[PDB]
Amino acid sequence: KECDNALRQLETVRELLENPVQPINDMSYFGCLDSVMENSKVLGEAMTGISQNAKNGNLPEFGDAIATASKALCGFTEAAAQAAYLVGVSDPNSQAGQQGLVEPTQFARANQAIQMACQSLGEPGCTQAQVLSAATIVAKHTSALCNSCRLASARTANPTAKRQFVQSAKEVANSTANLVKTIKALDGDFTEENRAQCRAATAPLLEAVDNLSAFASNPEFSSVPAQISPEGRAAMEPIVISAKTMLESAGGLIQTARALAVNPRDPPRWSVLAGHSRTVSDSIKKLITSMRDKAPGQ
Amino acid sequence: STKHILDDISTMFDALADQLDAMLD
């Protein structure tokens, strides 16, 4: 149900494999291969921990294990999807597509979140606690923006782009440092003066965010999907299918493992868990082999 | 250590602003 965030996150993750027409990360094919391997090691550990703590009934350790497995599965899928894309575009008939310098939706979410938080801490009807929590929100999304700018500069070879992205990021970080400072003063002594000062301090941050927005909007910095040929599509299918099956069986493993955690004495569920684990292993092996066989440059 | 959340935020952003400053020029 809506409760099972791990299962829902596996489903969300599967979307990466549905049509790899754009690069999802900055990994080379070598990077993808390394990632797959590392995440294999980590996933094995996790799956062992899941069984063990389901038997022993160690619910907190079990939960940590599910969280670990989930992370590894995310990492696997990102690597597999990226690898798929790289295999596709590498086909002679395929024309490559530009990686987006920033995620525009995630950017807009940061903008709106920062905005709401500033507006909150600006209010008269706002407790000391609420100002702090508002600040953690501002901080969360602000750092997200700066990090995205850092990546954007690394990605782009454009001279004005690299400079301005890093510059805008610096403005955001600076003015956020100024905001968090006056909020710390306000936390030291909660008074009208300090609250009005805080309402001022948001102006340069909002301006900085707005500037960065205008700059990032430029269609030169946006992503363009790849023209992937039927041959390229055929080449990447085994990787995609292996990755999908891996996710199916992993979801099955988690789902069954919860039931076993609440009721360990059930041989059928244990047999189902085993089957899921084995299909996961076989999917990972078939994925690795598929990535080797279809490795670009051949 | 048990540090103040605001202290941690300020530290993070000063550090990041320095890093960005240095990254280009």
Author numbering:
A (entry chain A): 1361 to 1658
B (entry chain B): 1177 to 1201
Relevant lines from the article:
Several proteins interact with talin via leucine-aspartic acid motifs (LD motifs) – short helical motifs that facilitate protein–protein interactions with the helical bundles of the talin rod domains – with the talin R7R8 domains being the best of the characterized talin LD-binding domains. Both Caskin1 and Caskin2 contain an LD motif in their conserved C-terminus, suggesting they might be binding partners of talin-R7R8. Using microscale thermophoresis (MST) we measured the affinity of the Caskin2-LD peptide to talin R7R8 as ∼2.7 µM. To further understand the mode of this interaction, we crystallized the complex and determined the crystallographic structure at 2.7 Å (1 Å=0.1 nm) resolution. The electron density map showed clear binding of the Caskin2-LD peptide to the R8 motif. The peptide was modeled, and the structure was refined to a Rfree of 26.9% with excellent geometry. The Caskin2-LD peptide was found to adopt a helical conformation that packs against two adjacent helices (α2 and α3) on the surface of the talin-R8 four-helix bundle, essentially forming a five-helix bundle. Analysis of the interaction interface showed that the buried interface area is 790 Å. The interaction is formed solely by van der Waals contacts between the talin-R8 and caskin2-LD helices, as hydrogen bonds are absent. The Caskin2 residues with the largest buried surface area are L1183 (120 Å), F1190 (113 Å), L1197 (105 Å) and L1201 (104 Å).
